């Protein structure tokens, strides 16, 4: 491992990320469960990116190609321990969503690509285009309550039916998420988060660990 300071370059920083299930009990009463969360310039250890290439798509526009183009300090591995300890009612009051916030000193238009991958193959891509808001002397890029795709909702349901967390972890060995934030107009990679998953051993907590991706 190589430990050094630089989720975020000096051009874009991830400030907040949270994936959640919000359940309406009645028009004035809601419960929200967090599956994972970030944010609720440190030294980061490193991971050799070559050991994750087979967990993500790898041809035109794939992870290896993106990393080669750089900047390499925009690339991170995120290990999540997800909290699956919640009810999953099957009714209209259930909303599965993701909220994220990025910040920059520069006013840009950014594209956020989220690729859901199974056995290293893309099964869903979500693409969101975001313009900046000036706030507190910087530019903020917020995605509020972006709906989860059907594949992900069904996948959470499937994991929850397993009787032991170690069985969920075995299934998750082949599940990854690739988040790439790009300057829409210049096509510069601003942030790339390669995400891997286990289930948290806490009863009501989620955890994460961030690593820099390095070429060897």
Curated annotation (Swiss-Prot):
Organism in which the protein naturally occurs: Homo sapiens (Human)
Organ and tissue specificity? Preferentially expressed in skeletal muscle. Lower levels in pancreas, placenta, and heart.
| Name the record gives this protein | Transcriptional enhancer factor TEF-1
Relative to the complete UniProt sequence, the shown stretch is 211 to 426 of 426
Q: Where, per UniProt, does this protein localize?
A: Nucleus
Q: Which disease is it linked to?
A: Sveinsson chorioretinal atrophy: Characterized by symmetrical lesions radiating from the optic disk involving the retina and the choroid.
Q: Which residues does the annotated region (Transcriptional activation) include?
A: 7-216
For this UniProt entry, which segments traverse the membrane? none
Q: Gene for this protein?
A: TEAD1
Q: How is it modified after translation?
A: Lactylation by AARS1 promotes nuclear localization and stabilization of YAP1, leading to increased Hippo signaling pathway. Delactylated by SIRT1.
Subunit structure of this entry? Interacts with YAP1 and WWTR1/TAZ.
* Function description: Transcription factor which plays a key role in the Hippo signaling pathway, a pathway involved in organ size control and tumor suppression by restricting proliferation and promoting apoptosis. The core of this pathway is composed of a kinase cascade wherein MST1/MST2, in complex with its regulatory protein SAV1, phosphorylates and activates LATS1/2 in complex with its regulatory protein MOB1, which in turn phosphorylates and inactivates YAP1 oncoprotein and WWTR1/TAZ.
């Amino acid at each position: 491992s190589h430990m050094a300071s630089m989720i975020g370059t000096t051009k874009l920083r991830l400030v907040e990320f949270s994936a959640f299930l919000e359940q309406q009990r009645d028009p004035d009463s809601y419960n929200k469960h967090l599956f994972v969360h970030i944010g609720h310039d440190p030294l980061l250890e490193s991971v050799d990116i070559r050991q994750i290439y087979d967990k993500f798509p790898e041809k035109k526009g794939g992870l290896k190609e993106l990393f080669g183009k750089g900047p390499q300090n925009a690339f991170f591995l995120v290990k999540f321990w997800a909290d699956l300890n919640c009810n999953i009612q099957d009714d209209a009051g259930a909303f599965y969503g993701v909220t994220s916030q990025y910040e920059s000193s520069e006013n840009m238009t950014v594209t956020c690509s989220t690729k859901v991958c199974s056995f290293g193959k893309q099964v869903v891509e979500k693409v969101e285009t975001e313009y900046a808001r000036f706030e507190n002397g910087r530019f903020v890029y917020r995605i509020n309550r972006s709906p989860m795709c059907e594949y992900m909702i069904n996948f959470i349901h499937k994991l929850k039916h397993l009787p032991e967390k170690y069985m969920m972890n075995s299934v998750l060995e082949n599940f990854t998420i690739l988040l790439v934030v790009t300057n829409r107009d210049t096509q510069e990679t601003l942030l790339c988060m390669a995400c891997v998953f286990e289930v948290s051993n806490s009863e009501h907590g989620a955890q994460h660990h961030i690593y820099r991706l390095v070429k060897d």
